[PDB]
């Protein structure tokens, strides 16, 4: 199927909340090898975000039930096996996304904005892997997530305005990484705070649409700031 029809079908699937189909469409689009437009990047990201969020929430539920079950209970084995199944699906999804990022999206990015977007995505999905990682694998997975986040962070500080929604969302997700993966609330707080503060300074120079887009992310930053400082 050609790119135009793939985008049509991806939007149709999005409307139907059939995100597996949407992800398949955007995966084919990406594999066609051309640089994605902002709309196409957004469609890919939405599709895989939902596809992985399903497994993430299911995994949280199952692992919560597991860590609340007596280690001598004969039922524990089934709970653990089911968690492992969900974990395998989650790992497969994240691996597909990271393959798309390495082989196509990062490789062909021709501007710092797309490169920041994709490196942030790499950090995101490595972080999703880190959420469920245990043992030696966890250390390297965390390192991969952090490296992607840090490269994206530096590029965005060099090439983008502090109000750019991509830079702000990168700051948000990086602060989340600090708080949830590295378990360092102070640095996460300072990261979100710095992004927010450096953004308010420039907000008034934007049109109302860019103001809207930036305000949303800044509100998320402040929400996390309030949660973590309590």
């Amino acid at each position: 199927m050609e790119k135009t029809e793939l985008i049509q079908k991806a939007k149709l699937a999005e409307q139907a909340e059939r995100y597996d189909d949407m992800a398949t469409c955007m995966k084919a689009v990406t594999e066609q090898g051309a640089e994605l437009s902002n709309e196409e990047r957004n469609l890919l990201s939405v599709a895989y975000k939902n596809v992985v969020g399903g497994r993430r929430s299911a995994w949280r539920v199952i692992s919560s039930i597991e860590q609340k079950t007596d280690t001598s209970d004969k039922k524990l084995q089934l709970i653990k096996d089911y968690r492992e199944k969900v974990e395998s699906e989650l790992r497969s999804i994240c691996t597909t996304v990271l393959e798309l990022l390495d082989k196509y999206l990062i490789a062909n990015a021709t501007n710092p904005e797309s490169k920041v977007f994709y490196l942030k995505m790499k950090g995101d999905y490595f972080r999703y892997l880190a959420e469920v990682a245990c043992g030696d694998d966890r250390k390297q997975t965390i390192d991969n997530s952090q490296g992607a986040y840090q490269e994206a962070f530096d590029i965005s500080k060099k090439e983008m305005q502090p109000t750019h929604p991509i830079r702000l969302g990168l700051a948000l997700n990086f602060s989340v990484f600090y708080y949830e993966i590295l378990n360092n609330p102070e640095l996460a707080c300072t990261l979100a705070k710095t992004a927010f503060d450096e953004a308010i300074a420039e907000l008034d120079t934007l049109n109302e649409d860019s103001y809207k887009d930036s305000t949303l992310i800044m509100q998320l930053l402040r929400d996390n700031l309030t949660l973590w400082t309590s």
């Binding site: 975000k49 989340v176 998320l220 929400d223 996390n224 949660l227």
Partner: peptide, 6 residues
């Protein structure tokens, strides 16, 4: 839970 970008 922390809010990431959606």
């Amino acid at each position: 839970r922390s809010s990431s970008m959606a």
